[PDB]
Amino acid sequence: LNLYQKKMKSIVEDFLKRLQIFDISRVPDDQMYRLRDRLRLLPVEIRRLD
């Protein structure tokens, strides 16, 4: 989708949140990105993809 502007610092945030326990604001943007870096290589679930 070439969204060179929907700076992803976005998705990671929500992600973590949805599994309460983690104090989001209280975790550096860093770890977060690295979190995306790993997510990216993950297969959607047929459902999702399809």
Partner 1 sequence: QQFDFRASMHMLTSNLTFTVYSDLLAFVSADTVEPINAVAFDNMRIMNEL
Q: Which of 17, 22, 31, 33 binds partner 1 (CB under 8 A)?
A: 33
Does 41 participate in binding partner 1 (rule CB under 8 A)?
no
Q: Which of 2, 5, 20, 25 binds partner 1 (CB under 8 A)?
A: 5
Does 25 participate in binding partner 1 (rule CB under 8 A)?
no
Does 39 participate in binding partner 1 (rule CB under 8 A)?
no
Q: Which residues of 2-30 are buried (b: 16+ CB within 10 A; e: fewer)?
A: eeeeeeeeeebbeebeeeeeeeeeeeeee
